[PDB]
Amino acid sequence: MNFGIGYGTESGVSFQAGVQQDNWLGTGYAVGINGTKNDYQTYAELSVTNPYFTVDGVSLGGRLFYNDFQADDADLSDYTNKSYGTDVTLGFPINEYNSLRAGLGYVHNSLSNMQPQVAMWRYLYSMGEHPSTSDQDNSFKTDDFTFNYGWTYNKLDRGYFPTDGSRVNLTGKVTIPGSDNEYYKVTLDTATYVPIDDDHKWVVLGRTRWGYGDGLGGKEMPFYENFYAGGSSTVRGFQSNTIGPKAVYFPHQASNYDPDYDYECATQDGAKDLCKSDDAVGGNAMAVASLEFITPTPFISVRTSFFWDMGTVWDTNWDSSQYSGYPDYSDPSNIRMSAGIALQWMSPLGPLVFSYAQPFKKYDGDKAEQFQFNIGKTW
Hints:
The chain has one helix at residues 118-126; strands at 2-8, 12-21, 30-37, 41-50, 59-70, 80-95, 98-112, 139-154, 165-175, 183-195, 203-215, 237-238, 285-295, 302-314, 336-347, 350-361, 368-369, 371-378. By secondary structure, it is mainly beta. The protein has a single domain (1-379), classed as Porin (Beta Barrel), CATH 2.40.160.50. The strands form two sheets. It has a 16-stranded antiparallel beta barrel. Strand 15 (336-347) and strand 16 (350-361) form a beta hairpin. It is classed as membrane protein. The entry lists the keywords barrel, Outer Membrane Protein Biogenesis, membrane protein, OMP85, yaet. It forms a monomeric assembly. The entry is titled "Structural Basis of BamA-mediate Outer Membrane Protein Biogenesis".
């Protein structure tokens, strides 16, 4: 057994619990069973990895998983995704700094409890489903097969508090024939550390993250695969996932009751017409960047930095023309920005990270959150 418990502004309190024998039972294979609990998510998996499936070091890995996601608790417009699936992946260690992955996946998604909103229904209609707008009672089920690939470059001088070098991670996916959805997603992550002194105590860190995905044959990318921005790990000073399009709600009713006094963003109690909102729904395109300046810590294993984060998320399929009475969510030029201080501490109780930041470029509906932190401990 091994454990992990954590607390932070992003995800509330996290519980990890699993067993993973690194050699099993002396076969060379590594097998593991693993579970997670979040404010918004409960994940479980059995994994199996033959790390010397070839003598060069070509690994062969398998994963079987279940995931339960509640979008409301992630500060998103409301839906539930109960999914499960499998992956089998080849890994190629081309050298000490680069590895390659290629794999096949299967995933079952089943959506329920979707609050009717424009972006979500536009996807639904593109799949030939015609649900009503009066209902938050709805269900949509899909099964997909994917081809998955990836490259990771890593020449960081150190793991935890790097001082020099860079890391790059490209991850891509596309549906293969036989799937209900037809789409591709690509993601690019970048981190590069540049020291400006000999003792390597002053370091400039530059980060970027890019994501683009879209439908292939008249279909749209499912919203449950959208990108998000704004929180501790992306652009600080903003509440988790607030950056980008906001749900535009249909006039509505209630799922099994309809009392007061809380919620109901487009309640029939007072409804006529479409409701603008501050619920984030994510996007199929994304760009975040960061430049930060790492300094010795006054006055005392622990790292402090001054940072400038910035980001955007948009909806390339948002019909600007038909929804001209609402904000242009297809517009990529709404770059949000922030500035702040961060302190990290690999402490005896476990890793500690804290930050204080000021959103100085903001847009209507963006929820600010200037103090963000994360605490953790593992058994």
